[PDB]
PDB file of C-alpha atoms in Angstrom:
ATOM      1  CA  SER A   1      40.455  11.560  -3.130  1.00 47.64           C
ATOM      2  CA  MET A   2      41.826  14.803  -2.303  1.00 44.77           C
ATOM      3  CA  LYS A   3      44.012  14.659   0.919  1.00 46.09           C
ATOM      4  CA  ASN A   4      45.387  18.023   0.503  1.00 47.81           C
ATOM      5  CA  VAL A   5      44.560  21.250  -1.322  1.00 49.43           C
ATOM      6  CA  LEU A   6      45.997  24.809  -1.798  1.00 50.04           C
ATOM      7  CA  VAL A   7      43.991  27.709  -2.931  1.00 53.29           C
ATOM      8  CA  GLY A   8      45.764  30.793  -4.518  1.00 55.96           C
ATOM      9  CA  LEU A   9      44.426  34.301  -4.625  1.00 58.33           C
ATOM     10  CA  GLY A  10      46.313  36.862  -6.633  1.00 61.91           C
ATOM     11  CA  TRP A  11      45.611  40.519  -8.133  1.00 61.74           C
ATOM     12  CA  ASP A  12      47.395  43.546  -9.434  1.00 62.09           C
ATOM     13  CA  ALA A  13      46.781  46.649  -7.559  1.00 61.45           C
ATOM     14  CA  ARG A  14      46.015  50.104  -9.351  1.00 59.03           C
ATOM     15  CA  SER A  15      48.893  52.336  -8.143  1.00 60.63           C
ATOM     16  CA  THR A  16      48.130  55.793  -8.586  1.00 59.40           C
ATOM     17  CA  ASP A  17      47.872  57.681  -5.363  1.00 58.69           C
ATOM     18  CA  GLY A  18      48.746  54.697  -2.674  1.00 55.88           C
ATOM     19  CA  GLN A  19      45.191  53.104  -3.492  1.00 56.89           C
ATOM     20  CA  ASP A  20      44.928  49.439  -3.714  1.00 60.29           C
ATOM     21  CA  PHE A  21      42.266  46.556  -3.696  1.00 59.04           C
ATOM     22  CA  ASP A  22      41.903  43.801  -1.156  1.00 58.54           C
ATOM     23  CA  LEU A  23      39.583  40.758  -1.589  1.00 59.43           C
ATOM     24  CA  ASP A  24      38.829  38.781   1.351  1.00 61.67           C
ATOM     25  CA  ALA A  25      39.532  34.949   0.911  1.00 59.50           C
ATOM     26  CA  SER A  26      38.369  32.617   3.447  1.00 60.43           C
ATOM     27  CA  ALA A  27      36.901  28.803   3.873  1.00 59.44           C
ATOM     28  CA  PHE A  28      33.526  28.261   4.837  1.00 60.71           C
ATOM     29  CA  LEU A  29      32.832  25.068   7.151  1.00 62.25           C
ATOM     30  CA  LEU A  30      29.766  23.130   7.369  1.00 61.01           C
ATOM     31  CA  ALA A  31      28.574  19.866   8.989  1.00 62.31           C
ATOM     32  CA  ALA A  32      26.884  17.112   7.501  1.00 63.03           C
ATOM     33  CA  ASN A  33      23.637  18.299   9.455  1.00 62.29           C
ATOM     34  CA  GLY A  34      23.075  21.179   6.963  1.00 65.25           C
ATOM     35  CA  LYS A  35      23.703  23.728   9.661  1.00 65.16           C
ATOM     36  CA  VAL A  36      27.065  25.555   9.937  1.00 64.97           C
ATOM     37  CA  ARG A  37      29.462  23.880  12.597  1.00 64.25           C
ATOM     38  CA  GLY A  38      29.953  27.639  13.379  1.00 63.34           C
ATOM     39  CA  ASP A  39      27.379  30.510  13.293  1.00 61.87           C
ATOM     40  CA  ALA A  40      30.165  32.268  11.638  1.00 65.42           C
ATOM     41  CA  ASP A  41      30.876  29.717   8.948  1.00 67.87           C
ATOM     42  CA  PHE A  42      33.431  32.747   8.112  1.00 66.42           C
ATOM     43  CA  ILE A  43      37.057  32.056   9.367  1.00 64.04           C
ATOM     44  CA  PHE A  44      39.672  34.711   8.422  1.00 62.16           C
ATOM     45  CA  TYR A  45      42.664  36.922   9.954  1.00 60.32           C
ATOM     46  CA  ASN A  46      40.525  36.746  13.279  1.00 57.30           C
ATOM     47  CA  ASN A  47      41.681  33.101  13.232  1.00 59.39           C
ATOM     48  CA  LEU A  48      45.458  32.223  12.222  1.00 60.45           C
ATOM     49  CA  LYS A  49      43.710  28.834  11.169  1.00 63.57           C
ATOM     50  CA  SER A  50      40.782  26.661  11.424  1.00 62.67           C
ATOM     51  CA  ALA A  51      40.512  24.755  14.778  1.00 61.04           C
ATOM     52  CA  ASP A  52      38.775  21.637  13.502  1.00 61.91           C
ATOM     53  CA  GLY A  53      38.734  22.751   9.670  1.00 63.64           C
ATOM     54  CA  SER A  54      42.335  21.838   9.344  1.00 60.56           C
ATOM     55  CA  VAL A  55      42.657  24.999   7.263  1.00 60.62           C
ATOM     56  CA  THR A  56      45.530  27.332   7.544  1.00 60.83           C
ATOM     57  CA  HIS A  57      46.166  30.709   5.778  1.00 62.70           C
ATOM     58  CA  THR A  58      49.779  31.191   4.564  1.00 60.93           C
ATOM     59  CA  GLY A  59      49.757  35.036   4.718  1.00 66.42           C
ATOM     60  CA  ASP A  60      47.144  37.451   4.390  1.00 69.27           C
ATOM     61  CA  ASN A  61      48.034  40.412   2.541  1.00 65.31           C
ATOM     62  CA  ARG A  62      46.299  43.771   2.045  1.00 64.82           C
ATOM     63  CA  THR A  63      47.349  44.949  -1.431  1.00 59.40           C
ATOM     64  CA  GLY A  64      48.219  42.098  -3.773  1.00 58.77           C
ATOM     65  CA  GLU A  65      50.821  44.409  -5.023  1.00 56.49           C
ATOM     66  CA  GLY A  66      53.095  41.964  -7.493  1.00 56.45           C
ATOM     67  CA  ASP A  67      52.100  39.712 -10.329  1.00 56.58           C
ATOM     68  CA  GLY A  68      51.285  36.271  -9.045  1.00 56.73           C
ATOM     69  CA  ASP A  69      49.352  34.239  -6.333  1.00 57.09           C
ATOM     70  CA  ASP A  70      49.305  36.799  -3.799  1.00 55.90           C
ATOM     71  CA  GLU A  71      47.754  35.065  -0.854  1.00 54.53           C
ATOM     72  CA  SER A  72      47.559  31.311  -0.274  1.00 56.19           C
ATOM     73  CA  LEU A  73      45.379  28.930   1.849  1.00 54.64           C
ATOM     74  CA  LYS A  74      46.924  25.629   3.125  1.00 53.33           C
ATOM     75  CA  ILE A  75      44.474  22.702   3.635  1.00 49.40           C
ATOM     76  CA  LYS A  76      44.968  19.323   5.145  1.00 48.70           C
ATOM     77  CA  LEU A  77      41.635  17.246   4.872  1.00 46.56           C
ATOM     78  CA  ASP A  78      43.448  13.884   5.783  1.00 44.21           C
ATOM     79  CA  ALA A  79      43.407  15.628   9.332  1.00 47.59           C
ATOM     80  CA  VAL A  80      39.679  16.459   9.326  1.00 47.18           C
ATOM     81  CA  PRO A  81      37.820  14.137  11.890  1.00 48.17           C
ATOM     82  CA  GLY A  82      34.234  12.878  11.033  1.00 47.09           C
ATOM     83  CA  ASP A  83      32.739  16.200  12.803  1.00 45.30           C
ATOM     84  CA  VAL A  84      33.142  18.493   9.539  1.00 45.08           C
ATOM     85  CA  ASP A  85      31.733  17.087   6.251  1.00 44.72           C
ATOM     86  CA  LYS A  86      31.943  20.007   3.784  1.00 47.11           C
ATOM     87  CA  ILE A  87      34.514  22.726   3.475  1.00 47.30           C
ATOM     88  CA  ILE A  88      34.284  25.153   0.497  1.00 48.98           C
ATOM     89  CA  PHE A  89      36.428  28.166  -0.389  1.00 53.42           C
ATOM     90  CA  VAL A  90      35.127  31.843  -0.836  1.00 55.29           C
ATOM     91  CA  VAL A  91      36.462  34.953  -2.190  1.00 54.53           C
ATOM     92  CA  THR A  92      34.342  38.384  -1.659  1.00 56.75           C
ATOM     93  CA  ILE A  93      35.094  42.156  -1.752  1.00 59.63           C
ATOM     94  CA  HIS A  94      35.940  43.817   1.763  1.00 59.03           C
ATOM     95  CA  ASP A  95      36.019  47.768   1.184  1.00 60.45           C
ATOM     96  CA  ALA A  96      32.849  47.219  -0.827  1.00 62.36           C
ATOM     97  CA  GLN A  97      31.138  48.039   2.400  1.00 62.94           C
ATOM     98  CA  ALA A  98      31.878  51.832   2.048  1.00 63.22           C
ATOM     99  CA  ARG A  99      33.140  51.760  -1.880  1.00 60.44           C
ATOM    100  CA  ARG A 100      30.536  48.994  -2.884  1.00 60.68           C
ATOM    101  CA  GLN A 101      33.436  48.081  -5.568  1.00 58.61           C
ATOM    102  CA  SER A 102      33.322  44.920  -7.750  1.00 61.78           C
ATOM    103  CA  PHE A 103      36.278  42.454  -8.251  1.00 65.35           C
ATOM    104  CA  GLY A 104      36.446  44.267 -11.930  1.00 62.94           C
ATOM    105  CA  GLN A 105      37.534  47.428  -9.991  1.00 64.27           C
ATOM    106  CA  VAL A 106      40.813  45.857  -9.768  1.00 69.36           C
ATOM    107  CA  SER A 107      43.032  45.415 -12.854  1.00 69.51           C
ATOM    108  CA  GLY A 108      42.321  41.947 -12.970  1.00 69.08           C
ATOM    109  CA  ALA A 109      42.184  39.568  -9.965  1.00 69.19           C
ATOM    110  CA  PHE A 110      42.383  35.713 -10.209  1.00 68.47           C
ATOM    111  CA  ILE A 111      41.841  32.630  -8.050  1.00 68.39           C
ATOM    112  CA  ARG A 112      43.656  29.403  -8.365  1.00 69.17           C
ATOM    113  CA  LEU A 113      43.177  25.806  -6.928  1.00 69.22           C
ATOM    114  CA  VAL A 114      45.677  22.998  -6.914  1.00 68.05           C
ATOM    115  CA  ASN A 115      45.542  19.561  -5.196  1.00 68.56           C
ATOM    116  CA  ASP A 116      48.640  19.970  -2.616  1.00 69.26           C
ATOM    117  CA  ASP A 117      48.457  16.304  -2.341  1.00 72.51           C
ATOM    118  CA  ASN A 118      49.507  15.236  -5.907  1.00 72.25           C
ATOM    119  CA  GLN A 119      49.442  18.528  -7.656  1.00 73.65           C
ATOM    120  CA  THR A 120      46.550  17.757  -9.868  1.00 74.80           C
ATOM    121  CA  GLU A 121      44.011  20.438  -9.723  1.00 74.07           C
ATOM    122  CA  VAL A 122      44.775  23.757 -11.493  1.00 75.61           C
ATOM    123  CA  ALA A 123      41.658  26.122 -12.333  1.00 77.06           C
ATOM    124  CA  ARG A 124      40.933  29.711 -11.935  1.00 78.63           C
ATOM    125  CA  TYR A 125      37.787  31.662 -12.199  1.00 77.63           C
ATOM    126  CA  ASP A 126      37.579  34.811 -14.416  1.00 77.14           C
ATOM    127  CA  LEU A 127      36.855  37.635 -12.278  1.00 77.28           C
ATOM    128  CA  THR A 128      37.494  40.347 -15.055  1.00 75.86           C
ATOM    129  CA  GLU A 129      34.486  38.827 -16.841  1.00 77.37           C
ATOM    130  CA  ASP A 130      32.322  37.517 -13.894  1.00 82.50           C
ATOM    131  CA  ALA A 131      33.159  40.728 -11.835  1.00 85.34           C
ATOM    132  CA  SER A 132      30.098  42.514 -12.971  1.00 87.84           C
ATOM    133  CA  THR A 133      28.125  39.343 -11.694  1.00 92.46           C
ATOM    134  CA  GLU A 134      28.415  40.319  -8.088  1.00 92.48           C
ATOM    135  CA  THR A 135      30.933  41.407  -5.111  1.00 90.01           C
ATOM    136  CA  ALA A 136      30.688  37.924  -3.291  1.00 88.47           C
ATOM    137  CA  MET A 137      31.029  34.325  -4.752  1.00 93.08           C
ATOM    138  CA  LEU A 138      32.265  30.862  -3.824  1.00 87.96           C
ATOM    139  CA  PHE A 139      34.871  29.374  -6.108  1.00 85.55           C
ATOM    140  CA  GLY A 140      33.966  25.715  -5.761  1.00 89.75           C
ATOM    141  CA  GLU A 141      32.844  23.250  -2.903  1.00 92.60           C
ATOM    142  CA  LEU A 142      34.317  20.146  -1.209  1.00 91.85           C
ATOM    143  CA  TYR A 143      32.490  17.304   0.402  1.00 93.37           C
ATOM    144  CA  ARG A 144      32.916  13.706   1.586  1.00 92.77           C
ATOM    145  CA  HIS A 145      31.599  10.742  -0.776  1.00 94.83           C
ATOM    146  CA  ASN A 146      32.633   7.067  -0.549  1.00 93.73           C
ATOM    147  CA  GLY A 147      34.555   7.856   2.704  1.00 93.87           C
ATOM    148  CA  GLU A 148      36.979   9.845   0.660  1.00 94.73           C
ATOM    149  CA  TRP A 149      37.080  13.746   0.007  1.00 97.31           C
ATOM    150  CA  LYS A 150      35.676  14.890  -3.398  1.00 95.24           C
ATOM    151  CA  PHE A 151      35.974  18.475  -4.955  1.00 97.43           C
ATOM    152  CA  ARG A 152      33.097  19.905  -7.276  1.00 94.18           C
ATOM    153  CA  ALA A 153      32.903  23.326  -8.544  1.00 94.43           C
ATOM    154  CA  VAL A 154      29.469  24.990  -8.429  1.00 93.51           C
ATOM    155  CA  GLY A 155      30.126  28.766  -9.390  1.00 93.18           C
ATOM    156  CA  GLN A 156      27.311  30.296  -7.269  1.00 92.24           C
ATOM    157  CA  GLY A 157      27.326  34.084  -6.831  1.00 90.71           C
ATOM    158  CA  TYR A 158      25.447  35.788  -3.912  1.00 90.84           C
ATOM    159  CA  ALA A 159      24.611  39.327  -3.355  1.00 92.91           C
ATOM    160  CA  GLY A 160      23.747  38.394   0.461  1.00 93.00           C
ATOM    161  CA  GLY A 161      26.653  40.153   2.221  1.00 94.07           C
ATOM    162  CA  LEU A 162      30.207  39.026   3.012  1.00 96.14           C
ATOM    163  CA  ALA A 163      28.764  39.619   6.687  1.00 93.30           C
ATOM    164  CA  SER A 164      25.453  37.910   6.047  1.00 92.68           C
ATOM    165  CA  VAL A 165      26.628  34.877   4.008  1.00 93.54           C
ATOM    166  CA  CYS A 166      28.744  34.013   7.263  1.00 92.72           C
ATOM    167  CA  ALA A 167      25.573  33.253   9.439  1.00 91.29           C
ATOM    168  CA  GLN A 168      23.375  32.975   6.567  1.00 92.21           C
ATOM    169  CA  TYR A 169      24.212  29.349   6.103  1.00 94.54           C
ATOM    170  CA  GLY A 170      23.514  28.810   9.722  1.00 92.39           C
ATOM    171  CA  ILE A 171      20.320  30.746   9.965  1.00 94.27           C
ATOM    172  CA  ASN A 172      17.797  28.663   7.595  1.00 95.67           C
ATOM    173  CA  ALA A 173      15.029  30.560   6.637  1.00 98.39           C
ATOM    174  CA  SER A 174      11.955  28.273   6.815  1.00 95.33           C
TER     175      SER A 174
END
């Protein structure tokens, strides 16, 4: 029965020579057909907000310099037609392409999730611990049930590739 949601990703950047970590937080869209409603299934800065996902990024940072929810994703399911039926959040490493660094490489990043509808949800994943688990992983999952939206954590890491996990959900390998 979640009508609104708000994810919050925050992490402390290690200041030493102007260096800084930048995790990629995005929402993956999936139709009820089992195929991505978009061969990309990966929306980000290239899209200030989803067109039919009703998802919107508050402000994409690039360092997280601070001490609290750095980035923020606002979502409005009450405005998602029957076209989309699944909307899950994701957070992976970006520079990892050239540096191949794990979330642990950071001082201690953290993800957050609250129901912006009634301010109910309030959970965060421990990266400092699961950091050694992978470099890309989904925080939770969201799907339609009795005509109402329903959240359900799954915790499933995948070393596929921030670039592959995008079309990988569309290209079904028989």
